[PDB]
Amino acid sequence: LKPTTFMLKYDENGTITDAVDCSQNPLAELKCSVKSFEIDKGIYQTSNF
Amino acid sequence: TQLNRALSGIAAEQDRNTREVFAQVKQMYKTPTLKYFGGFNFSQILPDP
Numbered sequence A: 001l002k003p004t005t006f007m008l009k010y011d012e013n014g015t016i017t018d019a020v021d022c023s024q025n026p027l028a029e030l031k032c033s034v035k036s037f038e039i040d041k042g043i044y045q046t047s048n049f
Numbered sequence B: 001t002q003l004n005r006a007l008s009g010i011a012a013e014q015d016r017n018t019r020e021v022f023a024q025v026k027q028m029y030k031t032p033t034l035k036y037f038g039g040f041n042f043s044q045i046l047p048d049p
C-alpha cells in the first residue's frame, strides 16, 4: 500500500463503481482536477512542476 | 488553484480581445505592386516588401 491520491465515483446507493489513480499518467492527473471522467478537447490547467 | 484559474481566465480573454479586432479577415490578399492608384500614393501604408 502506498499513499497516493484516488478519485472515486459513487452510485445512487453509495457503491464505488469506478476509480482513477491521480499519479498514473498525465491524462489521469487531469481527471482529478476537473472532477470528471470524460474531459473535452482543449488545454486545461494542471499542477505545476 | 483558485488563483491560477483567475489569472488564466484573464489571460484567455486577451486572446479573445485581439481576435475580435484583427481577425475579421477571411482571406489573405497579396501586396499589390501598384502603389499610385490614380496618383494616390500608398507606399507608406502598405508594407514595404
Ligand SMILES: *[C@@H]1O[C@H](CO)[C@@H](O[C@@H]2O[C@H](CO)[C@@H](O)[C@H](O)[C@H]2NC(C)=O)[C@H](O)[C@H]1NC(C)=O
Pocket (backbone or CB within 6 Å): A011, A012, A013
Ligand atoms: C439502488 O438500490 C435500489 C434498491 O433499493 C435499486 O432499486 C431497485 O432496482 C431493481 C433492479 O434494477 C428493481 O427491480 C427494483 O424495482 C428497484 N427498486 C426501487 C425501489 O427502485 C436501484 O436500482 C439501485 N441503484 C443503483 C444505481 O445501484
Ligand SMILES: *[C@@H]1O[C@H](CO)[C@@H](O[C@@H]2O[C@H](CO)[C@@H](O)[C@H](O)[C@H]2NC(C)=O)[C@H](O)[C@H]1NC(C)=O
Pocket (backbone or CB within 6 Å): B035, B036, B041, B042, B043
Ligand atoms: C510615394 O512617396 C514616396 C515618399 O517617400 C516616394 O518614395 C521616394 O521617391 C523618390 C523619388 O521617386 C526616391 O528618390 C526615394 O528613394 C523614395 N523613397 C522611398 C523610401 O522609397 C515614392 O516614389 C512615391 N510613390 C508613388 C507611386 O508616388
